[PDB]
């Protein structure tokens, strides 16, 4: 969770890979923005 000032491209998204089709590691790539300036609030908890 990031209530922080940054610019979003015309099509933000995420890149996911499955670690040799194991479906266990389930990593992600943060291709959603390119800045984190004037970042105010943050929050972390169990994934929804």
């Amino acid at each position, epitope marked *: 969770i990031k209530v922080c000032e940054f610019q979003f491209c015309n099509d933000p998204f995420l*890149g996911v*890979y499955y670690h*040799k089709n194991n479906k266990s*590691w389930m*990593e992600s*790539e943060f291709r959603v923005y*390119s800045s984190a300036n004037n970042c105010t609030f943050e929050y972390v908890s169990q994934p929804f």
Partner: antibody
Amino acid sequence: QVQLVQSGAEVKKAGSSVKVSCKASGGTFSSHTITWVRQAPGQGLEWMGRIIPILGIANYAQKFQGRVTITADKSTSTAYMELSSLRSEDTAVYYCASLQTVDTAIEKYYGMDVWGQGTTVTVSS
Amino acid sequence: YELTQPPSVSVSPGQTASITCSGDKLGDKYACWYQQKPGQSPVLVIYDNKRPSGIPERFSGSNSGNTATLTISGTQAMDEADYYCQAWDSSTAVFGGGTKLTVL
């Protein structure tokens, strides 16, 4: 898109500090982990390490432990390293490549998408 | 972790060439094969035998339990290059000796 153009061949004396760098001039400096690999004649390819610009975490190779000081700054949009204690046998052609990702564990889900022309180095003694 | 391969391989043009990159527990390790031509920089051609677009459909293969194989189809004169098989093992990359393809 990225080109990873760099300087040409350089001539220097043996035992002196070696400085090389690769500059993109194309796509964003960040968002693409930069890797360097050494090409030598009849000796295969040698891997030294990698540095992620945005993350700032640099990984070293087993053989290059402590002989390289890799640094990268986003403001300058350039990646460079300092090399010393280099012998004539270590002379070879150095290459720089990207990975398209800036995550430590994601690098295995990618390859060397783009390479450099190769900057040969000659040692004079 | 350690890669050993034959120093060189020879095959007639237009034939199917099989290249073996033997190692120690390289199954489920994402082995990648690169191509370097004389006078040209290395390029990406494989990343499970998976070929990037814009590359002619000549490179293919399969990953067995403890061996990786590359199959070449429609070999031509311009295929003179050196193939290096590497993988991201223990957060590190290891480069093999490589094989030089010879065409009569």
